[PDB]
């Protein structure tokens, strides 16, 4: 749901975030705005008028707070491309569910008319950890394994396509992955 | 300190801009100059009429406190010791820490500020939430340095005789002063329903933004041809034309008043005085911005 | 994870190569992430400094720690240039006034006394005729707000999700919005419940 | 003496003579931009200020190449003549650069720069031990196109490589603590470039007088506001005495200096100031420590990262941290006077009031040196003897040598 | 026993669902100086506290004053059970309002 969607809209309407999609219509190389955090949500829904968009905040939790008051308007065209809780040579895997949050918007990101991840992606809010982390080119390449009622599909092989996507085996089903 | 030379006594009252050269004529002042410290020598552009010598610390240096602190001095017979400040209590010259022997050098009924107003002053306090955790800050300091600075092992004296002289509790004083005569006020900026709140707000900050600036200079120009009051308090030096310049750039008339004077209605004044922040009294018909309101920097 | 230049050499890419080839990049506070990216390289480099060191890993062969660094940070200026090189402007938002910058007419919500102080805010912007919001969180906490402003001589109603604030009236509405704006070229006006309430 | 004197003479007259008998672009007179920074100003000049602002812009508008030094200790308004005349300077189209022997010095005049310069067109950057590569080759080592207009740096100012499209004013505060491989380039763009030396070291004043004609000088002493004595209480070592005034510091978010000078030991003393106060960011710093973790451990410190600065005597010294006001000198009669009072100096000089601590050790009594010498700290004479060793350093810096042989 | 005393002492027994539980990440391993330290770090830059385990209380200064050799800018504290409860409660309060960064 977008709640907020039209309260935002109204917001818009202003001539100084009129004058913002004016300029980035014409994409320059060098566009600076200055303003209080408050208007960090305006700002970005100012920008999405014109595309996709991604937006980088400090720290996880003012992604977190950025991701979501932009879903109070924009809904399912937000998502976050959170942060690795691990440094990239610490001797410790991140967490199972940010990594699966990351190659789950990736792929959406490569596929924005599949309605089987959700909705078009407009703007992606991530963190400095993020936008700096250097990432193989061949994450979105894995294939993930969609299960839906009908599709004929072999017991094993996806049983052998889901340890190789790094699921751990067990008897009973506890955690994720 | 005070020098003695002949028929002459240099002196430098502690609550004084220059010290003092008083010149006797058998057992009278005969002539009495500010000079100083530099070169020694008369400032003869300055006057003075007379000169009070208050005293330097918070006691009288008596036979009482020279006996007392040499019955004292029995008890515990280097310079940062107990003994040596004792010592030199005995024959009567004063020394740094003595402040913490009162209660056995001049031991009397220890009394508070409120007693020394006049009768029937109230008392205001400001912010009285922040007054308590400071006076909880101050005791717990306090009885720190006591502990630290007086115990057993610091002397080589009893620590509750001492704590007459330290730290009274926020309601110990409240309770004095209203026991003395005079009302305990309070002023706070917290919400209560059970005090009376004043028809002014505070001003407009513009945070060091242009756009804030612009709408509180467009305000006062609102504001003036309104037929209302405007004023602008500038504590800085030489910064109360620049502020006409700006609100001319606003397209809004401006002066700077004499010192003293209030401003006119319909025109903004710029008044030089000392104001941290400013003020919105709408049944004054007022409006006061500083020089603090307009860059977010103090003085 | 720690392995990876070495169990799977291949050229590193960045975020900036996944995003829609129109896609800009808009960083918040843009001195506060160069200091967080000054802090996430030192950790970072920390991290692989201690965590495969020569005192940690097993004797008679050491562990390419500059091969390592092929999976490391980029640094704040590498990852702008790489972004604008791929057809991704890098833009900027900020809160300390820049002069070579361009300043938005949208002031921050007044709210840190400050409760009656600001409801007779909003019922004097509300009675001027102009556009006002309140944004609650909860949608029980927003009837609260319709008669905590009501118990002040002001009225206040509750806005459909995705509908537009009346002209003169205020009004509570369920939303995630943070902190409000105040922006006079709309004469517009919204005020949340996390600046509002002490919370 | 007096031959090994003449050595000295001889070479200031020649520095005198070479420099007035070369050639030298003088500066206009003062932009109308000039004043309104003398507007922002957010205090009242001194009579000794602005008689200096004057002398500083007589000889920049004359013809002659500029040498001139300015003297008077911390807290005056000595930086700010700097900003002046490096604004008349660069507002007649030449550059500036200010070169520091400390980074924590780069970092605080360049904040002092940037501060006041704002609001007007100067563009100024700063090239120190930790910035980039990014920022310093590109934007601070990148110039010659004239992009920056003054620059505060460091002897990297001075590597192989640096050029300046018409540079016409350097200033160096604190010239004597530069290396002996630094001081010979300083030394040498004077006669070339106008320059303006500051310093804190004071010489006496039959010397300002002596060489009035061979090195120009123009000293401050007005005080803008008046500097109250620090409290100093001296006497025996006592862990809940020295918690109690570290912690009295932490409370007003103020810092504090913790004396320690064998550095042998010099972390064991730390962990017992911890131990102390465990509340406390206690770090140590000291000379035998390699250069990058001492500017970064005092980078963090006046960035107020830690609380209490466990160093030596010649760390401390060397340090401008207005909010350290509390001074602990442990075994103080270790110390020569004029170490104590040169210790003292630099705590409590601002607004706010300060407290040192010189504290003897409790298990050994006191030796029959230093027994009066504490109690001559305690007094607000005797200290007279150490006030003169103060002056003599300074002679050593706007003579050029240091003669030790003959001041014996 | 919830139900067998369903009569004499109800219960609201409610409990986080593993579904929406984010666990903690579990490192298992030698002990390393530099691990250690670079991980206390990294708690302290997000204005974090740490606990530091530590049973043998007559060796407890002995702890805190290793891991002050190991991260020195940091604010350590100890607190066990043998000491007067003031200093205990004292202690505690503190960490709880940041007053310290590892207990």
């Not at chain 4, 310093?199 to 010397?207: D, G, V």
């Given at each position: ?11 818009l309407?202003?001539p ?17 705005l200055?303003?209080p ?11 999405a008028?014109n ?5 980088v ?6 992604a977190?707070?950025l ?27 991140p967490?199972?569910?940010?990594v699966?949050?990351?190659?789950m ?17 407009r703007?992606?809010?991530t ?12 994450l ?17 092989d996806?049983?052998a ?9 067990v ?7 | ?41 008369s ?12 005293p ?9 406190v020279?006996?007392?602190a ?12 107990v ?17 913490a ?21 109230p008392v205001?306090?400001c ?5 308590r955790?400071?006076a ?40 004095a ?15 209560d ?15 060091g ?35 006409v310049?700006?609100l ?34 709408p ?16 003085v | ?8 050499p ?12 129109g ?6 506070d843009p001195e ?32 390419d720690?500059?091969?390592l ?6 640094t ?8 604008r ?10 809160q300390?006034?820049?002069e ?14 400050n409760?009656?102080?600001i ?11 102009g ?12 009837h ?19 509908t ?6 205020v009004?509570?509405?369920?939303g ?5 704006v ?15 309430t002490?919370? | ?7 000295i ?6 520095l ?35 008689t ?8 920049m508008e ?20 700097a900003?002046?005349?490096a604004f ?5 189209g ?15 005049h360049?904040q002092?720069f940037t ?16 910035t980039d590569?990014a ?29 300046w499209?018409?540079?016409g004013?350097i200033?160096?505060?604190e010239?004597?603590r ?7 380039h ?14 804190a ?6 010397l ?19 500097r109250?004595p ?8 006592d ?33 017992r ?13 000291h ?52 170490q ?15 407290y ?33 060793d ?19």
């Amino acid at each position: 749901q977008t709640p907020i969607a039209g309260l935002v809209e109204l917001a818009l309407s202003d001539p100084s975030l009129q004058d913002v999609i004016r300029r980035a219509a014409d994409r320059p190389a060098d566009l600076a705005l200055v303003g209080p955090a408050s208007a960090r949500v305006l700002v970005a829904a100012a920008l999405a008028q014109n595309g996709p968009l991604l937006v980088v905040a400090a720290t996880g939790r003012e992604a977190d707070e950025l991701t979501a008051e932009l879903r109070g308007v924009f809904g399912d065209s937000v998502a976050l491309f959170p942060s690795w809780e691990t440094l990239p040579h610490e001797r410790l895997s991140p967490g199972v569910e940010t990594v699966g949050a990351r190659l789950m918007l990736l792929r959406r990101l490569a596929r924005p008319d599949d309605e089987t991840l959700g909705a078009p992606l407009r703007v992606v809010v991530t963190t400095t950890r993020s936008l700096l982390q250097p990432m193989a080119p061949d994450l979105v390449d894995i294939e993930p394994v969609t299960l839906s009622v009908g599709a004929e599909m072999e017991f094993e092989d996806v049983v052998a396509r889901l340890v190789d996507l790094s699921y751990t085996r067990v008897d009973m089903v506890g955690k994720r992955g | 300190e005070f020098a003695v030379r002949g028929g002459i006594l240099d002196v430098f009252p502690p609550t004084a801009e220059h010290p003092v050269r008083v010149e006797f004529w058998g057992d009278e002042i005969s002539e009495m100059r500010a000079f100083a410290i530099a070169d020694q020598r008369s400032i003869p552009e300055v006057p003075v009429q007379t000169v009070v010598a208050v005293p330097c610390r918070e006691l009288l240096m008596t036979d009482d406190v020279r006996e007392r602190a040499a019955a004292l001095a029995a008890e515990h017979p280097v310079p940062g010791t107990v003994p040596d400040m004792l010592a030199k209590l005995a024959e009567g010259i004063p020394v740094d820490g003595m402040e913490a022997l009162l209660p056995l050098l001049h031991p009397i009924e220890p009394t508070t500020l409120t007693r020394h107003l006049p009768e029937g002053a109230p008392v205001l306090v400001c912010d009285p939430e922040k007054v308590r955790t400071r006076a909880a800050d101050l005791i717990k300091t306090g009885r720190e340095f006591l502990e630290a600075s007086w115990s057993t092992a610091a002397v080589g004296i009893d620590l509750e005789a001492l704590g007459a002289s330290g730290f009274v509790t926020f309601e110990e004083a409240r309770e004095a002063a209203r026991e003395g005569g005079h009302p305990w006020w309070t002023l706070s900026q917290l919400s209560d329903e059970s005090a009376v709140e004043l028809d002014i707000r505070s001003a407009p900050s513009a945070r060091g933004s242009q756009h804030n600036l612009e709408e509180i200079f467009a305000m006062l120009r609102a504001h003036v041809a309104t037929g209302g009051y405007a004023a602008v308090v500038t504590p800085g030096i030489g910064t109360a034309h620049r502020v006409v310049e700006q609100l001319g750039e606003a397209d809004t008339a401006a002066t700077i008043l004499e010192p003293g004077t209030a401003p006119k209605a319909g025109v903004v004044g710029v008044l030089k005085g000392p104001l941290c922040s400013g003020v919105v009294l709408p049944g004054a018909n007022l409006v006061i911005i500083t020089e603090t309101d307009l860059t977010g920097n103090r003085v | 994870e720690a392995l990876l230049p070495l169990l799977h050499p291949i050229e590193p890419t960045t975020l900036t190569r996944h995003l829609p080839e129109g896609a800009p990049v808009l960083v918040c506070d843009p001195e506060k992430v160069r200091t967080r990216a000054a802090d996430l390289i030192k950790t970072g480099r920390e991290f692989l400094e201690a965590s495969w060191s020569t005192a940690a890993v097993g004797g008679d062969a050491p562990i390419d720690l500059e091969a390592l660094g092929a999976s490391g940070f980029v640094t704040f200026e590498e990852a702008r240039e790489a972004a604008r090189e791929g057809g991704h402007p890098w833009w900027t938002l900020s809160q300390l006034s820049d002069e070579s910058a361009v300043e938005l007419d949208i002031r921050s919500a007044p709210s840190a006394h400050n409760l009656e102080e600001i409801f007779a805010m909003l019922r004097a912007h509300v009675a001027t005729g102009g556009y006002a919001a309140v944004v609650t969180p909860g949608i029980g906490t927003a009837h609260r707000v319709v008669e905590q402003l009501g118990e002040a001589d002001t009225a206040a109603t509750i806005l459909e999700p995705g509908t537009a604030p009346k002209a003169g009236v205020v009004g509570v509405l369920k939303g995630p919005l943070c902190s409000g704006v105040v922006l006079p070229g709309a004469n517009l006006v919204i005020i949340t419940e996390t600046d509002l309430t002490g919370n | 003496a007096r031959r090994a004197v003449r050595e000295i003479a001889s070479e200031l007259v020649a520095l005198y003579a070479k420099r007035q008998s070369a050639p030298g672009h003088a500066f206009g007179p003062d932009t109308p931009w000039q004043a309104e920074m003398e507007d922002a100003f957010g205090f009242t000049e001194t009579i000794d200020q602005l008689t200096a602002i004057q002398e500083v812009k007589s000889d920049m508008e004359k013809p002659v190449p500029m040498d001139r030094v300015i003297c008077g200790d911390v807290g005056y308004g000595k930086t700010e003549i700097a900003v002046r005349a490096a604004f008349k300077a660069v507002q007649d189209g030449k550059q500036v650069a200010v070169l520091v022997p400390t980074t924590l010095l780069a970092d605080q005049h360049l904040q002092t720069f940037t501060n006041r310069m704002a609001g007007f067109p100067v563009t100024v950057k700063g090239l120190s031990r930790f910035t980039d590569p990014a920022e310093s080759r590109a934007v601070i080592e990148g110039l010659k196109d004239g992009s920056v207009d003054v620059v505060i740096g460091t002897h990297r100012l001075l590597q192989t490589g640096v050029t300046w499209k018409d540079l016409g004013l350097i200033i160096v505060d604190e010239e004597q603590r530069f290396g002996v491989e630094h001081k010979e380039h300083i030394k040498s763009m004077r006669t070339h470039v106008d320059v303006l030396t500051m310093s804190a070291t004071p010489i006496p004043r039959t010397l300002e007088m002596s060489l009035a004609g061979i090195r120009e000088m123009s000293t401050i002493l007005t005080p803008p506001e008046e500097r109250y004595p620090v409290l100093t209480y001296v006497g025996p070592h006592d862990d809940k005495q020295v918690a109690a005034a570290l912690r009295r510091e932490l409370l007003r978010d103020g810092q504090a200096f913790y004396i320690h000078n064998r550095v042998r030991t010099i972390d064991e003393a730390a962990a017992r100031v911890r131990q102390l106060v465990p509340e406390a960011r206690v770090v140590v710093a000291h000379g035998q420590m390699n250069e990058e973790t001492l500017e970064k451990t005092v980078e963090g410190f006046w960035n107020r990262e830690y609380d209490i600065l466990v160093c030596t005597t010649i760390v401390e010294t060397g340090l401008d941290i207005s909010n350290a006001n509390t001074l602990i000198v442990e075994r103080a009669d270790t110390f020569g006077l004029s170490q104590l009072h040169q210790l003292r100096g630099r705590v409590g000089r601002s607004r706010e009031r300060g407290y040192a601590y010189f504290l003897y050790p409790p298990n050994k009594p006191l030796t029959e040196t230093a027994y009066d010498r504490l109690a001559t700290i305690a007094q607000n004479a005797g200290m007279a003897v150490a006030m003169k060793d103060l002056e003599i350093r300074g002679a050593g810096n706007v003579l050029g040598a240091e003669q030790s042989g003959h001041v014996a």
